[PDB]
């Protein structure tokens, strides 16, 4: 209220002690727990913790990968957390070699159940997919425990190691030869409304464009064939209601200079990926366009 209260210097957290230290220090006790440095205090990245059956955690022992919860019309397992790589057996964008590689690692019980559950409803994918973000640790049980990162950077405890977001090479897509100082990342689902299949193509775009209209005006200019396919299945088959040719959600943002090609090896299966070293996750809703 006085001059010194406003003229007080701002507060720094590392200078003052923790709550527990000054709580124990008053009543004069010491216990076997070391409390002078408390972990995870200076961790700006908002995280969580999710369970997953063992059938999905292949290509997941490496830290850093997208994680999307998929819907399931049942009651007990009605939500299921699948990785992006296990979604690779659904994208028509994926070539045959990479598909036969990564389908030969998910030969367990629950992986094919999610594969069937994607192709059994009357709805599309993006009416059943909900993004959760990126993992940073596993636990490796028979029911493995993951720690996904909701908003912020990806790092180890004590920040000694910056985890990197991995995306497979087939889903990667750029629309400029000159990347800016920054480029955001987007998750693109674009549906092919052709005759025998409505199997969509999954893409992850790294663009320097921020404003959403200035993204969709080139999204139409890059996916024109699927727009013609949508209007073609509309004019060909009436009494059907197609919708949402392309769906785009903002995944996060990167630094536009650490993006480099790498690979992950698991069960001696080399898969060429794109490595974004300093990725900050910032999720968004599945925004839909035509």
């Amino acid at each position: 209220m006085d001059a010194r209260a406003v003229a007080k210097r701002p507060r720094d957290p590392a200078d003052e002690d923790n709550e527990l230290v000054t709580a124990l220090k008053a009543k004069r006790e010491v216990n076997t727990i070391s409390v002078r440095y408390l972990y995870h205090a200076d961790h700006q990245a908002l995280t969580a913790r999710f369970f997953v059956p063992e059938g999905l955690v292949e290509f997941e022992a490496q830290p850093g990968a997208l994680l999307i919860r998929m819907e399931t019309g049942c009651d007990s397992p009605r939500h299921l957390y699948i990785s992006l790589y296990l979604l690779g057996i659904r994208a028509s964008n994926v070539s045959a070699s990479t598909r036969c590689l990564l389908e030969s690692v998910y030969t367990a019980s629950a992986a094919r159940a999610a594969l069937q559950w994607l192709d059994l409803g009357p709805h599309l994918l993006h009416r059943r997919l909900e993004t959760l973000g990126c993992v940073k640790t596993v636990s490796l049980g028979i029911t493995s425990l993951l720690t996904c990162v909701m908003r912020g950077y990806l790092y180890n405890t004590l920040k000694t190691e910056v985890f990197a977001l991995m995306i497979p090479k087939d889903m990667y897509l750029t629309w400029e030869e000159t990347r800016g100082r920054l480029q955001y990342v987007y998750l693109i689902i674009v549906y092919d409304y052709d005759g025998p299949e409505t199997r969509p193509g999954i893409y992850v775009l790294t663009s320097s464009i921020a404003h959403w209209q200035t993204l969709v005006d080139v999204a139409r200019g890059k996916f024109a064939r699927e727009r013609c396919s949508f209007v073609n299945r509309r004019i060909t088959r009436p009494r059907q209601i197609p919708l949402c040719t392309g769906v785009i959600q903002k995944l996060g943002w990167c630094l536009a200079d650490d993006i480099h090609t790498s690979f992950l090896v698991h069960k001696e299966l080399k898969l060429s990926v794109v490595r974004l070293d300093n990725f900050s996750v910032e999720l968004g809703d599945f925004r839909e366009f035509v």
Binding site: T47, A48, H79, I235, D285
Partner: protein
């Protein structure tokens, strides 16, 4: 090391048992009409916006421009409120009647229940009654908007029996262990002005699209430069089987009916769940505004 907190008082003689009724509502989001610092309790919740005359979706439009605080602490003679900022996580109580799960995209809707119900024992005064906005996940919100709008579209032909059985069908909804039912927007065979404006705007934009677009794309075929444009008028020809200032007026009224529908056709996800507490009473959500 205090946080920015908006203090709300109470003017009535709130008893001890009424405070004990209030103390259970810790993580319950309450809207605020205007970012003041000290506010009376008459502007805390939707009961400043209750209108028997006006409809429901007008409250949905008026909930968009609010400020959605959280009850930080309840004590004597003032209540703490915490304005959330984008990026920090907060606990939210499941004041809505729908179960939640990990990672659902949460949205804020005006409550479709009001007044007498077996679980609507809320914070009440002699004239004040605290009412809470509903917090439901995103596709349930989309589905509920579609159900109420279609049930508003059947307001005129309610005399028939197929339409009545259709209203009985659309009024209920099955969800994850939910036998939930909504109220009908029509009462006593006449429709409220909010729903009437909504269905009128939608019917007007549908009628103007069915009128103008054939002429405009037929004019566009002379300056045609993409094959996507010639094939779209082909389905107009398939489906079908003036003063210029009036034409400008028609286009302007089309865009007016488009502008008067953004309160229905879109909604912003507010919370997404990091963790749900066991017994599903509360959950921990990051903010997203």
């Amino acid at each position: 090391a205090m946080e920015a907190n908006i203090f709300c008082t109470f003017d009535h003689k709130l008893s001890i048992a009424d405070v004990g009724k209030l103390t259970k509502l810790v993580a319950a989001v309450v809207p605020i009409p205007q970012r003041l610092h000290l506010i009376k309790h008459y502007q805390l919740g939707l009961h400043q916006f209750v209108d028997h005359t006006r409809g429901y979706v007008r409250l949905r439009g008026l909930l968009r421009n609010m400020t959605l605080t959280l009850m930080r602490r309840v004590e004597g003679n003032q209540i703490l409120l915490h304005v959330p900022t984008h990026g920090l996580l907060y606990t939210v109580l499941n004041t809505g009647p729908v179960t939640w799960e990990k990672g659902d995209a949460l949205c804020v809707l005006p409550p479709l229940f009001h007044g007498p119900l077996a679980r609507e024992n809320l914070l009440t005064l002699g004239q004040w009654e605290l009412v809470l906005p509903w917090i439901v996940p995103m596709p349930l919100a989309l589905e509920i908007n579609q159900r109420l709008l279609i049930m508003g579209l059947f307001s005129l032909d309610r005399s028939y029996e197929e339409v009545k059985a259709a209203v009985q069908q659309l009024q209920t909804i099955t969800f994850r262990d939910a036998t939930f039912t909504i109220p009908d927007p029509v009462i006593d065979q006449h429709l409220l002005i909010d729903m009437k404006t909504a269905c009128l705007s939608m019917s007007m934009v549908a009628n103007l699209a069915s009128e103008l677009t054939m002429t405009y794309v037929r004019k566009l075929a002379l300056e045609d430069s993409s094959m996507l444009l010639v094939k779209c008028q082909e389905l107009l020809m398939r489906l079908d089987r003036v003063s210029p200032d009036d034409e400008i007026a028609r286009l302007s009224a089309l865009f007016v009916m488009l502008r008067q529908l953004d309160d229905l056709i879109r909604e912003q996800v507010v919370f997404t769940v990091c963790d749900v507490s066991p017994d599903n009473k509360s959950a921990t959500c990051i903010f997203k505004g």
